[PDB]
Design a protein around this ligand. Structure first.
Ligand SMILES: *[C@@H](CC(=O)OCC)[C@H](C[C@@H]1CCNC1=O)NC(=O)[C@@H](CC(=O)[C@@H](NC(=O)c1cc(C)on1)C(C)C)Cc1ccc(F)cc1
Length: 160
């Protein structure tokens, strides 16, 4: 259902928020591609906020999916789900308690997002996978995976 919206993208993953909106991590988008999903790159309207990368296609690409709510992170303390897809195809939902929103230094670079704590991990191929949580009856996507700290269970969710 939601898992079909996570797709192989460059060195990582990306997520269909809607038929026309695809988000991923700046570290993962292929910089030399001439088209994405058959659409020439010039027709694709791309925005970048640090490690958050959103792609707006001129025409619906995934007509089978419904638009999902995209917000800038989650209320502090929200237990979200990092929806990890592995190249083996295995689905690995990882619970993460979301922490402070901040402008953070990560390997010298500035990135905007939200810290989280894996509850009970993540690997270099996992960047771009989405963080999601359920509010009422609505699913809400809050960002994409971009980093995880060594010597700890902290993960970084890049946000808009
Ligand atoms: C995914 C992207 C990737 O592979 O990039 C290579 C071009 C990858 C996922 C993490 C790898 C280990 N586990 C993961 O979940 N992301 C990265 O490698 C980013 C860098 C890191 O994750 C480092 N983490 C940190 O520096 C850090 C600091 C804090 C508070 O938390 N984490 C190491 C653990 C490797 C790539 C990146 C992201 C954003 C940047 F601004 C610079 C670099």
């Amino acid at each position: 259902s939601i898992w079909s919206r996570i797709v192989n993208f460059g060195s990582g993953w990306g997520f269909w928020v809607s038929p026309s909106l695809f988000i991923t991590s700046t570290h993962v988008i292929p910089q030399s591609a001439k088209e994405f999903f058959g659409v020439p790159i010039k027709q694709i309207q791309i925005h970048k906020s640090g490690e958050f990368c959103r792609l707006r296609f001129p025409k619906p690409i995934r007509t089978d999916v419904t638009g999902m709510i995209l917000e800038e992170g989650a209320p502090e303390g929200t237990v979200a789900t990092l929806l990890i897809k592995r190249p083996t195809g295995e689905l690995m939902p990882l619970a993460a308690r979301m922490g402070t929103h901040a402008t953070m230094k990560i390997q010298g670079a500035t990135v905007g997002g939200q810290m989280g704590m894996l509850l009970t991990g993540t690997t270099p191929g996992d960047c771009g996978c989405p963080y999601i949580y359920k509010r009422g009856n609505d699913y809400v996507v809050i960002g994409v995976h971009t980093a995880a700290a060594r010597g700890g269970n902290t993960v970084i969710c890049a946000t808009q």
